[PDB]
Design a protein around this motif. Structure first.
Motif, PDB file in Angstrom:
ATOM      1  N   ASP A 149      56.415  29.346  24.385  1.00 21.17           N
ATOM      2  CA  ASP A 149      55.138  28.837  24.860  1.00 21.17           C
ATOM      3  C   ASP A 149      54.039  29.806  24.443  1.00 21.17           C
ATOM      4  OD1 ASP A 149      52.983  27.719  26.131  1.00 21.17           O
ATOM      5  OD2 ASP A 149      53.956  27.514  28.081  1.00 21.17           O
ATOM      6  N   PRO A 150      53.140  29.428  23.532  1.00 18.51           N
ATOM      7  CA  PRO A 150      52.053  30.350  23.157  1.00 18.51           C
ATOM      8  C   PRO A 150      51.119  30.675  24.309  1.00 18.51           C
ATOM      9  CG  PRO A 150      51.594  28.152  22.331  1.00 18.51           C
ATOM     10  CD  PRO A 150      53.005  28.115  22.875  1.00 18.51           C
ATOM     11  N   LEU A 151      51.063  29.828  25.341  1.00 23.41           N
ATOM     12  CA  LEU A 151      50.258  30.146  26.512  1.00 23.41           C
ATOM     13  C   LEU A 151      50.837  31.319  27.290  1.00 23.41           C
ATOM     14  CD1 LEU A 151      49.418  26.547  27.750  1.00 23.41           C
ATOM     15  CD2 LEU A 151      48.035  28.133  26.366  1.00 23.41           C
ATOM     16  N   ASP A 152      52.145  31.564  27.164  1.00 18.34           N
ATOM     17  CA  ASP A 152      52.759  32.703  27.834  1.00 18.34           C
ATOM     18  C   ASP A 152      52.560  34.010  27.070  1.00 18.34           C
ATOM     19  OD1 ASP A 152      53.609  31.335  30.064  1.00 18.34           O
ATOM     20  OD2 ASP A 152      55.636  30.959  29.320  1.00 18.34           O
ATOM     21  N   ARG A 153      52.358  33.955  25.747  1.00 20.79           N
ATOM     22  CA  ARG A 153      52.045  35.176  25.007  1.00 20.79           C
ATOM     23  C   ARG A 153      50.584  35.563  25.208  1.00 20.79           C
ATOM     24  NH1 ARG A 153      53.536  31.524  19.812  1.00 20.79           N
ATOM     25  NH2 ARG A 153      55.676  30.904  20.390  1.00 20.79           N
ATOM     26  N   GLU A 154      49.685  34.569  25.269  1.00 22.55           N
ATOM     27  CA  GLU A 154      48.299  34.866  25.616  1.00 22.55           C
ATOM     28  C   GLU A 154      48.202  35.392  27.041  1.00 22.55           C
ATOM     29  OE1 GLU A 154      45.587  31.597  25.190  1.00 22.55           O
ATOM     30  OE2 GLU A 154      44.013  32.636  26.318  1.00 22.55           O
ATOM     31  N   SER A 206      57.578  47.264  33.428  1.00 23.68           N
ATOM     32  CA  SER A 206      57.160  46.119  32.632  1.00 23.68           C
ATOM     33  C   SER A 206      57.551  44.842  33.366  1.00 23.68           C
ATOM     34  CB  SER A 206      57.786  46.127  31.226  1.00 23.68           C
ATOM     35  OG  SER A 206      57.211  47.111  30.379  1.00 23.68           O
ATOM     36  N   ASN A 207      56.909  43.735  32.993  1.00 21.53           N
ATOM     37  CA  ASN A 207      57.148  42.455  33.647  1.00 21.53           C
ATOM     38  C   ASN A 207      57.097  41.319  32.636  1.00 21.53           C
ATOM     39  OD1 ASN A 207      55.637  44.107  36.057  1.00 21.53           O
ATOM     40  ND2 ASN A 207      57.170  42.668  36.860  1.00 21.53           N
ATOM     41  N   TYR A 208      57.806  40.239  32.963  1.00 18.80           N
ATOM     42  CA  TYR A 208      57.620  38.968  32.279  1.00 18.80           C
ATOM     43  C   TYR A 208      56.425  38.245  32.887  1.00 18.80           C
ATOM     44  CZ  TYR A 208      62.381  39.720  30.466  1.00 18.80           C
ATOM     45  OH  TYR A 208      63.509  40.244  29.879  1.00 18.80           O
ATOM     46  N   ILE A 209      55.617  37.622  32.030  1.00 17.94           N
ATOM     47  CA  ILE A 209      54.343  37.025  32.415  1.00 17.94           C
ATOM     48  C   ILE A 209      54.371  35.539  32.089  1.00 17.94           C
ATOM     49  CG2 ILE A 209      51.857  36.968  31.954  1.00 17.94           C
ATOM     50  CD1 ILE A 209      52.968  39.338  33.631  1.00 17.94           C
ATOM     51  N   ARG A 210      54.025  34.707  33.070  1.00 17.16           N
ATOM     52  CA  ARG A 210      53.936  33.266  32.881  1.00 17.16           C
ATOM     53  C   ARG A 210      52.515  32.799  33.166  1.00 17.16           C
ATOM     54  NH1 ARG A 210      57.969  30.257  36.432  1.00 17.16           N
ATOM     55  NH2 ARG A 210      56.460  30.954  38.020  1.00 17.16           N
ATOM     56  N   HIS A 211      51.938  32.046  32.229  1.00 16.59           N
ATOM     57  CA  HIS A 211      50.598  31.508  32.409  1.00 16.59           C
ATOM     58  C   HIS A 211      50.571  30.545  33.596  1.00 16.59           C
ATOM     59  CE1 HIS A 211      52.123  27.803  30.574  1.00 16.59           C
ATOM     60  NE2 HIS A 211      51.028  27.222  31.029  1.00 16.59           N
ATOM     61  N   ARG A 212      49.362  30.239  34.055  1.00 18.28           N
ATOM     62  CA  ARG A 212      49.164  29.342  35.182  1.00 18.28           C
ATOM     63  C   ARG A 212      48.425  28.085  34.742  1.00 18.28           C
ATOM     64  NH1 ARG A 212      48.070  32.849  40.708  1.00 18.28           N
ATOM     65  NH2 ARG A 212      49.842  34.280  40.416  1.00 18.28           N
ATOM     66  N   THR A 213      48.773  26.964  35.381  1.00 17.24           N
ATOM     67  CA  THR A 213      48.224  25.662  35.018  1.00 17.24           C
ATOM     68  C   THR A 213      46.892  25.398  35.710  1.00 17.24           C
ATOM     69  OG1 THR A 213      49.783  24.816  36.670  1.00 17.24           O
ATOM     70  CG2 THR A 213      50.348  24.511  34.348  1.00 17.24           C
ATOM     71  N   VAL A 263      44.795  39.586  39.065  1.00 16.46           N
ATOM     72  CA  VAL A 263      45.719  39.871  37.967  1.00 16.46           C
ATOM     73  C   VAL A 263      45.332  39.169  36.670  1.00 16.46           C
ATOM     74  CG1 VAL A 263      47.677  40.374  39.450  1.00 16.46           C
ATOM     75  CG2 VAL A 263      47.251  38.026  38.725  1.00 16.46           C
ATOM     76  N   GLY A 264      44.610  38.056  36.743  1.00 14.70           N
ATOM     77  CA  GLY A 264      44.223  37.343  35.542  1.00 14.70           C
ATOM     78  C   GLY A 264      44.807  35.950  35.453  1.00 14.70           C
ATOM     79  N   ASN A 265      45.155  35.383  36.609  1.00 11.83           N
ATOM     80  CA  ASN A 265      45.672  34.016  36.718  1.00 11.83           C
ATOM     81  C   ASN A 265      47.036  33.877  36.044  1.00 11.83           C
ATOM     82  OD1 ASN A 265      45.358  31.363  37.744  1.00 11.83           O
ATOM     83  ND2 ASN A 265      44.805  30.642  35.690  1.00 11.83           N
ATOM     84  N   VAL A 266      47.931  34.828  36.332  1.00 10.02           N
ATOM     85  CA  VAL A 266      49.272  34.843  35.762  1.00 10.02           C
ATOM     86  C   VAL A 266      50.285  35.132  36.862  1.00 10.02           C
ATOM     87  CG1 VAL A 266      48.503  35.534  33.462  1.00 10.02           C
ATOM     88  CG2 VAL A 266      49.152  37.286  35.144  1.00 10.02           C
ATOM     89  N   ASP A 267      51.556  34.873  36.544  1.00 10.32           N
ATOM     90  CA  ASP A 267      52.686  35.179  37.416  1.00 10.32           C
ATOM     91  C   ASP A 267      53.395  36.421  36.895  1.00 10.32           C
ATOM     92  OD1 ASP A 267      52.487  33.151  39.366  1.00 10.32           O
ATOM     93  OD2 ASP A 267      53.551  31.720  38.073  1.00 10.32           O
ATOM     94  N   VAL A 268      53.443  37.464  37.716  1.00 11.34           N
ATOM     95  CA  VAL A 268      54.098  38.716  37.357  1.00 11.34           C
ATOM     96  C   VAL A 268      55.532  38.652  37.869  1.00 11.34           C
ATOM     97  CG1 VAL A 268      54.025  41.210  37.533  1.00 11.34           C
ATOM     98  CG2 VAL A 268      51.897  39.904  37.470  1.00 11.34           C
ATOM     99  N   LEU A 269      56.479  38.452  36.959  1.00  9.70           N
ATOM    100  CA  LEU A 269      57.857  38.168  37.322  1.00  9.70           C
ATOM    101  C   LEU A 269      58.785  39.265  36.819  1.00  9.70           C
ATOM    102  CD1 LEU A 269      57.662  34.414  36.313  1.00  9.70           C
ATOM    103  CD2 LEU A 269      57.225  35.429  38.547  1.00  9.70           C
TER     104      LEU A 269
END
Lengths: 465, 465
Positions: free
Chosen positions: B236-241, B300-307, B316-322
């Motif tokens: 998902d390119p939205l998750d790299r951004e 470090s964390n995995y980052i998921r964009h938000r809808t 945090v920037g409208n993301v999920d810190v997982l």
């Protein structure tokens, strides 16, 4: 934390590199049969006349792969066994087709999925004499397209296909430096050849997607090699740009026309008119012609920018390729290959670099391995204790593990080069890449090295289920 | 191969977490003295009232440092010891100055170069009551600039200065979530405070560069914390951004205005009004105000964009810190800190990310370390055998080694957090970050762990002779 259960791993070999039996069952001469006859072209003055005699030792090679836990195997097809003269209107030899078909059956019966390379440098010699071989922008892509179809049709039980292995090696060493077959030295033809190998690749991928892929839901792609880069002086922005441009001249050369649709700007600025322009028809063949990304990787180097403009015979992008940075830090210890220094971090940095530039494609690491310095002169006892090669596979595969499991690099397979010691081209049989020692002086017997028994328990730790 | 011989390594502490003696020698209360008295803000209902009693154990902490091979030591000046009320026209406590002046003499006598942090989160309580503390954009940057000049004049033998430790923790935990002092919760104040802390950083840098730096060839900069990111789903390119955007809201929040001139565009897009703009006079203070990059890093964390679009209370920037990605891969094992998972690759990743975005600046890793889950309940003998911490440092330090010798990251130092277990803020003393165990119940006695003795033989391997 864990690799998914669908990750594959096996070993990799090349037809002219192991098979031997160069005149057997009507095999036509390849350009490497011709090239090796030139004195001084191979360092040890040898050829692939016998190699590992693998053509006649099919049962032995499959038993070795099974005994090492290899459930996949990458080998190449000798074109001149299938079509001895190579051309589309030339008679097909059934004996080599039957040979490789029986091999695939003998592989699948052992539970080993094949991963087949169509062109591993061994072009039929006749096509080279008939119209210029790789240099012909018109004939060669037509002859390769037909040859690919003959194989797609002959081996319906194969889903994993490879067009060209390391097309850069067929262009610059083959037409620029002249170290590989056919042995020419030009400032212009390595760029025409690379263009011809791209179009030939795109034509075969189109034929395969249109008629043969949906039969068994297979896949096809090109295999590009590429060693990573780091600035020689991290403080000089010119060396950071020189690090990127070096990668562009090595790998983006073929990959940008496949994924983006045109050659890297940096090559076009330097090569000008010597770099061909894709015709609309040629562009439709090449653009988007990878189901997967076939990746060979070996080392990394420090890249120092150059202050004078590039010469006509420059092929690397007008940079210096070093093993020490400005501060004297070394890439790694020497091997038997003068160009190979181990750098596990460059394996992961390259996987990530491919991903970011081409939108994270499906990557198959098709070659990875090392030579060992002085290994050919060691006694048999010391050769089998190849801790240098064991360590070379642990750090690299675990680096690959980090790129896949943390960065998210979509890599789905890995193939260690090579299954056995073989004919390392211009280096001859002195350079040993195999995890299996081959004693050429005594009937080409196989003796698995400490590296061979090392990869099963390593992948068992990293792959789930 | 080898780091340069001028590479520094030592340990880091902070005034309020180790000193104790909160009212000895005329020390006014800070906002953390006020904060720990509020019930429920501190996990174990403790405070820094005694801490490690390091204020009265000067020669002993210096002995521990000299015994562990540390040639440098990072520590912070308690503001309210120098100026009990903090203001520029307020009386100056000479006893506090003399205390820290004698500590520098003892460190330099012990052959330990100091690395002093001006502001480690202990705003004098009087400033908070006088004009709102960090909220005041006019008064606070003036009081901090004068407090800095006091210490520059008081400690001329010091070359290594640090303005603020982790301004993000002063901003959001202290004014957005209320987890840190002064314990406020606003959708606007965090972004105001961060601006004031940036201008408070520039005035002191200018004062230092113009009137104190050149006599002994010193340096000054700000310390920014940053945990690296990887896409939750790399396809998902939205998750790299999103993984890039998270780094911007977390570190480039302060580093972009210092190196590039303004806040990141992504922060402008989300915050609008609440993100202040630099005045002509403010921009002359902030832009260019870093002699070196001070870097704190941990995990470090995995980052998921938000809808959904970001809500007003987002920081945090409208993301999920997982801690897991889509495929199920884990960052690393749990610690006592819920937010900390060991990930050595991310340390090197963050080093290169800082270097590529900010023209490869000089980096000093001012904090790196980890806590241990359940360590506070272990017996004394089990605590000292902290192989978990021993392995953490060995991997992160060697990851840094690769960053410096291969990528060329211009890192010139590394400070391990912490020299001793201390008051881990809202967590209390239950969270232990030290390489030295401290028996708080038995007179704060020091007992070095296996990690404490691990660093010297390792840096002896990696730093040239």
């Amino acid at each position: 934390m864990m690799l998914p259960k669908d990750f594959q791993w096996g070993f990799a070999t090349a037809a002219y590199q192991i098979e031997g039996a160069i005149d057997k069952d009507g095999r036509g001469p390849s350009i490497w049969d011709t090239f090796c006859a030139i004195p001084g072209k191979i360092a040890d003055g040898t050829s692939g006349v016998t190699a590992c005699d693998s053509y006649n030792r099919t049962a032995e090679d499959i038993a070795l792969l099974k005994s090492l836990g290899a459930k996949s195997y990458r080998f190449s097809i000798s074109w001149s066994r299938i079509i001895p003269k190579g051309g589309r209107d030339d008679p097909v030899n059934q004996l080599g087709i039957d040979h490789y078909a029986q091999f695939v059956d003998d592989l699948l019966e052992a539970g080993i999925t094949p991963f087949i390379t169509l062109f591993h440098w061994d072009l039929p010699e006749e096509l080279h004499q008939r119209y210029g071989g790789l240099l012909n922008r018109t004939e060669f892509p037509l002859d390769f397209e037909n040859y690919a179809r003959v194989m797609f049709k002959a081996l319906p039980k194969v889903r994993n296909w490879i067009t060209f292995n390391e097309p850069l090696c067929s262009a610059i060493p083959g037409y620029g430096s002249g170290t590989f077959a056919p042995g020419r030295q030009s400032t212009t033809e390595p760029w025409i050849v690379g263009h011809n190998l791209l179009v030939a690749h795109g034509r075969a991928v189109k034929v395969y997607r249109d008629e043969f892929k949906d039969l068994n839901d297979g896949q096809i792609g090109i295999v590009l090699n590429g060693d990573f880069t780091y600035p020689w002086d991290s403080s000089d922005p010119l060396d950071r740009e020189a690090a990127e441009r070096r990668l562009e001249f090595f790998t983006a050369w073929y990959a940008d026309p496949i994924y983006l649709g045109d050659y890297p700007a940096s090559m076009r600025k330097q090569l000008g008119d010597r770099l061909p322009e894709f015709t609309p028809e040629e562009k439709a063949f090449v653009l988007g012609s990878n189901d997967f990304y076939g990746m060979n990787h070996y080392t990394s180097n420090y890249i120092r920018h150059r202050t004078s403009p590039a010469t006509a015979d420059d092929t690397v992008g007008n940079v210096d390729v070093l093993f020490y940075n400005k501060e004297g830090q070394c890439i790694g210890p020497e091997t038997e290959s003068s160009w190979l220094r181990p750098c596990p971090a460059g394996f992961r940095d390259f996987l990530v670099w491919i991903s970011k530039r081409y939108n994270y494609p499906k990557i198959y690491v098709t070659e990875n391995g090392t030579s060992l310095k002085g290994e050919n002169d060691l006694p048999k006892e010391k050769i089998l204790e190849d801790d240098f090669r064991v360590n070379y596979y642990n750090e690299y595969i675990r680096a690959m593990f980090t790129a896949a499991t943390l960065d998210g690099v979509n890599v789905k397979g890995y193939f260690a080069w090579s299954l056995m010691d073989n004919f390392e081209w211009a280096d001859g049989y002195v350079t040993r890449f195999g995890v299996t020692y081959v004693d050429y002086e005594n009937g080409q017997q196989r003796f698995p090295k400490k590296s061979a028994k090392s990869l099963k328990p390593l992948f068992d730790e990293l792959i789930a289920k």
